[PDB]
């Protein structure tokens, strides 16, 4: 007979023991660790609350790719890629170009956790998820992998992350800053807490229902499998939130949700918003970028943060309110320098989707449509040199993304400046501007691709230049994803 | 040769745009121009665009040239129309 | 415009096709970009140090070391499929011999000779999984690291394995103090404070390639020989063919670990001066090893003679290296 | 370590033995066996091609149910069988209908030969053949009954069989005939060879190939992955054969061929026939009946026979000539008598289809042509009831199928009656009458549908009693598949 | 217009949703529909009168045979993903105590006790697939016929394990006659005759309810007792833990065929007359059930004893059905 | 009552028709007629219908009634377009 696993789970994490030979900082340097003052005995309080064992691990994974891999054996012939909207494979050469190197990269986060986490439960559990993120880089290469002989776009689904390409800095600015150089208690906050069960977990939840709407089962099965990975380690950060405030941090705890949340909320902006509300075929949007936001992003953070016994962080307010602009401005901006991504970003601003638009965000018309409106009378004259750009945009140097914000009839855009010593920054925010204030020296030379281009990086220095130092060249290079056809409405 | 960030009234985003020490705020404006009117904006014939300093608003005469505008490389200037 | 390509791009013109391995596997560690900034943020962090430093710096040279291949080509996918079919055999195993009331056939020394050298284990075996997880996250190659990876799970199966184990020893013998020990005799007992030093010097040796050597080179093969190859022959001796078959199962992973580490060992030795470099470390920690191997077998039943089949057995490991 | 399979393969089969408390023919009764005088040595020469081992079958079969029900799980909240064409649904409802109970039915049949095959290496084959209809039966009864609340046609996955609806009996009769009334020897011919390995393989596969062509992946994945089950079993007649030309019955053995070929062959007419020419939409048809016919299933049966000592039946040069005519004449027969199946027959004769037909078949619409002429005129003028039937077709009594054959201006039906006994037989062609005489006692008191409408045991004895009789009822009584949407190409 | 079903019609109205169980394995069998004329044919067919014969005329009856559930539930998908776990166990086994060196250790006597009481049951093994298989093809309902499909399937498994060993026995004593003196065993060895008997006559017993009786209630429980209880009792006290293991394991299929039958049994007793009827059958296997087991293990040591547990154990099986 | 089986021309079918004993080839070929002209067989005009014993082509005449013709139950018969 077998034992119960309530009978046993405990002495797998009963693994904490006094070194002798080192020191126990030794054994546990602070910067890896993180443990805060607060002792071993202290950090043994950690419940994970969804535990799991290395026999159910290897076997239910196992069928987990079973059936992953025997769906897309099953539809590849089938060739669905070939006749999918070009703005769903637009957004899979995103998906993966971002994501790929990232996720296998989180495997090293967990291992972060896994070493040097004070805590017998967290060791297991990051071990655990090592192994997850260790199949989320294989699989998410593995599949793009089947489409490399169409396009050399699908090629980014590897190099991307190796490249200096503006989106490609932006990703591992937030990853890097999120999970690669933290401690071990600070990459469970950051990484588990506050990007994977607060973003990541109901965006790949939307993700594989808008496959799945746009006919691609493949990727469907793919991203849902995924996403059921997600809540075992995912739900690192919880108990060490609890820990550190019961014990003295609360306001460490507090400080590091608040910069995990607002850099979270930045990338998801130029990844995420612009997807949902332009990308996906008018018919099959359920629902607005904003709307997504409240229900299932920002009502869960509100939730967990009380549960904690934290507080909603201070820039919470003008967070709801950007709900309104900046995704606009950062889908407007990659359309407009869409030479410069690689994938074809599609406008999304034709009659019907423009008064979908307004619907949902209503001025949009008279501010982002102004924009809008100009380009496409461009494009309907024969001037389609006027909607690609001749300089570069000023980018923010925390999120490394362009500083835009509502234009229009209700212009808004502002620039929070920073001089630190003898060199002025730019933030995109009056949060992002924060980040760096509260750390100065985890920013302080690092430099946007603004600033390589200025300081003479970047030769020759010009936008052909810019564009062989990231890496981009015809065939890859984005341009209109359906090829200016919503322009044939406006004749 | 100079840096400045441009922040045209009624665009979307602030834009790398270089400009030349000798440049009146006229010039500079007619710089920033390019790469917002026609483009993103809409020209209004019937106004006059204006160099203001992003940070505390200080609005620069039509005719003093960024030599003596005491600007920080990169310094981000908003560009508005006025009368 | 860009022709697609038959491959990734830094797989293309390979003359043979790409394996799956080589496709989900092969380089994909970009803080190896930038040398002098390994991470997208300012260069003086201390993780950037760390790197600079402990992966960088290492001694152990090679101008290329994404061209590391793993013998088995492991992939979390065929990982799981090998691990299930054994886990499989092994909870069989748990399963039929505890319906065959093996446990209470056990005599009671045997009993507390399990309560002093098997179930203390869990915390070497932990230790273990910690030694081979840092050796994951400061490796040079994402093959290196991925082979360091999965052996890292199967630290954590061993660990469970004798978990379970303990838990069930400790319902057929409640006196013995199964499951509530262990953590006293590893910190205080003789016979496992000469694996105690080791190891917890071993952890704090930051330099990856010093991490691989004092880990997979010198402490494995001395940990895998007493306690798997000593202790499980012993027990069958003894009565416990359990455990006789578990140890057996567990050295299945060992005997993979060795395989990957001889290999990175082969291609390290590719470059001039590197033979030195491992042989310098391993005379450096080949001393705690001895004290370990003494200390754990001498207080075993014929323990002179375990001793020196463990010490010959281990050496004999580094020695098919080179 | 582990021993190579071909080192102990052998004594897997080596159990046969010399009874001593039983006689052989107690233990080997001649009616189940069909030794045929041929002795247990000589039955032991049994070599199958393929050979499987238990542990290697459900190690193999466990990951293929894995997929295909993984598949199915993935594709359910897709529901494209609500926008599938009709042509394909009712292709769905017709096969489950027809061969879910019969592929159960066969495990009966497999264990015919395992338990009455004096060939050890038959036996064994057997058993796992066994399995793999069990196998069969239960995955086609779990996958249509996910549609039982779209339509009670559905149902008829698991009630056809049950019915005395005239394709059912059809069904039966070829099925009882081949499978399940004959002894061991003739079982392994007659169904693993002839129809098995003659028929069902192909079939499969090009019925795979229609379902991705149709977009059903779902049903697509299920059908490939029960034809990969049929080599393993299909192959237990070849060496039969062998043994039986190598002793004493070559004469008997090719009777058995002769009459399984031909039998097959019929109910292939009306089952698979009509469906690639008419309820396939044109542009998915790849080729056409015939050309399937000679390409896959005549020039293999050729080649078999050639390779095994044996020759081509009698009826070989007629056959060839059916191919042009036969399956048209039972597509008309369903299409005219639609009321009186459980699926929508699709008429397929619009002008493009009508074209395609007469390139494929020189001479169809003058022909065949014009039935439909008169059909689709009367449809054009509101007659509706004049394409539907008011009395019954005369039934073949061997294939128990309508005895229909070339129309219009090469008119060319014939009946081979046969009166034997005091009754008038009759018989849709010369070959259904031969095997009636080959072998009297084996069908003479069986009646067809006609006959028992004749002697009075339907009742009322009118057509809504018929219907009755074959528990047939609005709902999934069969009407036109497109609604007569191929009407309006005429007015 | 007939409105769409939540299931199928036979189904329909359970109060329960269906369970797949239910939805892949009831109601199958249609030669049952017409009892006068079972096949589609002439009704004077031999295979017609076979049915009606031993099918329908058998003195087991019941008004409801259909209503029949296999106390496990087993349906294809689910016994291959049982048994692909038994089999990834025992195949471990096989692998790993090989590596151990297994056969090698045992004495030469227990060798010999091998070639005489363990490998010729790769015949009496077969026998049971047969008389399985039979009563598959004659029962009246598909639940019945499907507990029957997987219960031959795993005789046919333990055939296979045992093909599997005697290949390797032979290969570590290639003097014994391991795989080639079988046959000449079974056949002659008075050990075997009361077996050989036993099965031989059963397997001619045509009348699905006694062939049911025959094989599954008295052949099977005495076979069971002696060739896996017995026999492997004994393998383990000799030394030889792989058969004691593999016995074990086989017994888990054993185990579940007493299942069913036993809720066979009980289903039957539903019906008047039903017990009085298998009883009469039993009383009169049941002698031919002690002559086998008499003469299989009184020829093994401390056979006598054997004898007892052995008689003792099958009838149990019996007794606990009522 | 008598059962015979229709074999009409230029029909693709042979279909159960039940004919009166007392019924004369021609109006056996009235009723054969009812199933097979304007369903699937234009009608013929110019010709007359004759019945024809399947089996050896015996022509019988217009006139002659079934229960003359010596057919067996269920006799299969052609339904011919002649002058
Ligand atoms: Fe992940
Ligand atoms: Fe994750
Ligand atoms: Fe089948
Ligand atoms: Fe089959």
Redesign the interface.
Known sequence: ???KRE??YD??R??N??????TEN??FPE??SGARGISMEAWEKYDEPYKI???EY??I???K???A???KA??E??GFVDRADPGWVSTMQLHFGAIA?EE??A??AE??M??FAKAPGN??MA??G??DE??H???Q??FP?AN?????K??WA??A??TNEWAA?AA??FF??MM???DSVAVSIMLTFAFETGFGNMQFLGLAADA?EAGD?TF??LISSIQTDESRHAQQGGPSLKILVENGKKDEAQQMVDVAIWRSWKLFSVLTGPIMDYYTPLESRNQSFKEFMLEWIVAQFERQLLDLGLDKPWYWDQFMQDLDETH??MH??VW?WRPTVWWDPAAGVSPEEREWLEEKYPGWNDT?G??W???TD?LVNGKPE??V??????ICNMCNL????????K?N???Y?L?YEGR?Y?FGSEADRWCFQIDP??????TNL?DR??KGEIQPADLAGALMYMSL????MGDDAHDYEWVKAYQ | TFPIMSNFERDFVIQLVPVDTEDTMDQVAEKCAYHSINRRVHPQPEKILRVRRHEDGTLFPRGMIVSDAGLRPTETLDIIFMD | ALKPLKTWSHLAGNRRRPSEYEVVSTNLHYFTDNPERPWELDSNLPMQTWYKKYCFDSPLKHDDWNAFRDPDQLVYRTYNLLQDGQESYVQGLFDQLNDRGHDQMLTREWVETLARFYTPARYLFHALQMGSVYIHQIAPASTITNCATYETADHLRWLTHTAYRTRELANCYPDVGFGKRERDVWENDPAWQGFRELIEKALIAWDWGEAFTAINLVTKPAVEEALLQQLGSLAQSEGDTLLGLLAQAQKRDAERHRRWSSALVKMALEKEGNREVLQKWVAKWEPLADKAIEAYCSALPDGENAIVEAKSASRYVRQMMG
Chains 1, 4 share one sequence.
Not at chain 1, 473 to 476: I, L, S, T, W
Request: with cysteine; net charge neutral.
């Open positions: 007979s077998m034992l009978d046993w002495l797998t009963t693994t023991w006094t070194p002798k030979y080192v030794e054994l910067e890896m064992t290395y026999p290897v076997s994974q196992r069928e790719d079973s059936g891999y025997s769906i099953a539809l012939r089938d190197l296998y990269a495997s090293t291992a972060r896994a070493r060791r297991n071990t655990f090592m192994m260790n199949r880089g294989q699989i290469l593995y992998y490399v002989k169409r396009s050399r699908w090629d590897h190099k992350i190796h800095i591992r600015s890097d800053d690669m150089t933290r799945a089962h469907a099965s606009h401005g407007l901006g407009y982002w102004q924009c409106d100009v380009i461009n006027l909607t750009p001749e300089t570069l945009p000023t362009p500083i835009a914000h509502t234009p229009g009839n212009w855009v502002k620039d400046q001089e002025l730019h020296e985890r920013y302080e030379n690092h603004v281009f200025l060249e015809p065939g890859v």
